[PDB]
Amino acid sequence: LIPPLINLLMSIEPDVIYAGHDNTKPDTSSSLLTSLNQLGERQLLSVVKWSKSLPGFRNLHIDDQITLIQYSWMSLMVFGLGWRSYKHVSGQMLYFAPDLILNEQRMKESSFYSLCLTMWQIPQEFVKLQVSQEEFLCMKVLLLLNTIPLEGLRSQTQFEEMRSSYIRELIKAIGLRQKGVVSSSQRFYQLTKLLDNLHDLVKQLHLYCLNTFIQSRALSVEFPEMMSEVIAAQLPKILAGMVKPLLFHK
């Protein structure tokens, strides 16, 4: 049977989120990126809502809650994109939303094919490892908790306890299918290594983001309110490496 914290995590997952994209018109770089940013804003709002229901999170200092959301949003978005692509189209298209799906041809015709290929890595990796929903749910929490300030958090003690709790929960999730101690220990390494490796992929997305934000008027790319807020709040600092990424391994 499923451990209760994992069942809770499944129950607080966001519903389907639409981009609001107009698919009756041919793609342009402006229109596609603008629609992705509108989808982004909606997903960001859902992350905030989810975080209010996430066990432990509300008990961190409010300033730590804001910081963790501001540090982790890109990671959470691309991880979710990977999962949706894996679950709905067998990993073979980028499933941003039910109304915004990029097959490879649409990726190629875009102005950001290379970015698409970088993002397309994650679902191909989920296909490879056959990530379970229970593993995904725990891993996604750990991504929320995977970078802290250089000076640490105000609620550092509670944060450490929360993070450790979800790491123990991931171990329980692995235990649902992987019977055997050797396989289970190796799977822990693999999933946590995948999380370590996401830091590098996300850095590429962060650089793209900040360049796009700076150039948004010239590119005719709209950045909505909360997205602009989180970018302005922390993105240069994150890109500069003036934060502490938490690594599971060397």
Residue 84 marked ligand-binding? yes
Closest residue to bound ligand OR8 by CB: 209
Closest approach, Cβ 66 to ligand OR8, in A, equals 18
Between 186 and 225, how does the x/- string for binding to ligand OR8 read (CB under 6 A)?
A: -------------------x--xx--x-------------
Closest approach, Cβ 214 to ligand OR8, in A, equals 10
Size of site (CB under 6 A) for ligand OR8: 16
Closest approach, Cβ 133 to ligand OR8, in A, equals 19
Return the number of the residue (84 or 163) whose C-beta is nearest ligand OR8: 84
Give CA–CA dist 134/50, Å, rounded: 17
The footprint of ligand OR8 on residues 89-118 (CB under 6 A) is: 96
Tokens 């391994």 locate to 249
Q: What does the chain come to in residues?
A: 250
Strands 100-102, 94-97: pairing kind: antiparallel
Return the number of the residue (101 or 119) whose C-beta is nearest ligand OR8: 119
Coil, helix or strand for 100? Answer: strand
Coil, helix or strand for 244? Answer: strand
Give CA–CA dist 182/162, Å, rounded: 27
Q: Indicate which single residue of 5, 6, 9, 39 sits in contact with ligand OR8 (rule: CB under 6 A).
A: 39
Are the C-beta atoms of 224 and 132 separated by less than 8 Å?
no
Closest approach, Cβ 71 to ligand OR8, in A, equals 14
Residue 44 as a binder of ligand OR8 (CB under 6 A): the answer is no
Residue 81 as a binder of ligand OR8 (CB under 6 A): the answer is yes
From 47, 49, 69, 54, select the one nearest 5 (Cα to Cα).
Answer: 54
Closest approach, Cβ 184 to ligand OR8, in A, equals 31
> Contacts for 159-166 with beta carbons within 8 Å, 24 or more apart?
159/60, 159/64, 161/56, 162/56, 162/57, 162/59, 162/60, 163/246, 165/5, 165/56, 166/56, 166/138, 166/141, 166/142
Q: Indicate which single residue of 40, 91, 123, 149 sits in contact with ligand OR8 (rule: CB under 6 A).
A: 40
The footprint of ligand OR8 on residues 5-34 (CB under 6 A) is: 33
Residue 238 as a binder of ligand OR8 (CB under 6 A): the answer is no
Within a 13 Å sphere around the CA of 152, how many CA atoms are in the beta-carbon half? 7
**HEC sequence for 122-150:** HHHHHHHHCCCHHHHHHHHHHHHCCEECC
Residues contributing to the annotated binding site: 84
Residues contributing to the annotated binding site for progesterone: 84
Query: Residues in the site for ligand OR8, rule: CB under 6 A?
Result: 33, 36-37, 39-40, 43, 74, 77-78, 81, 96, 119, 205, 208-209, 212
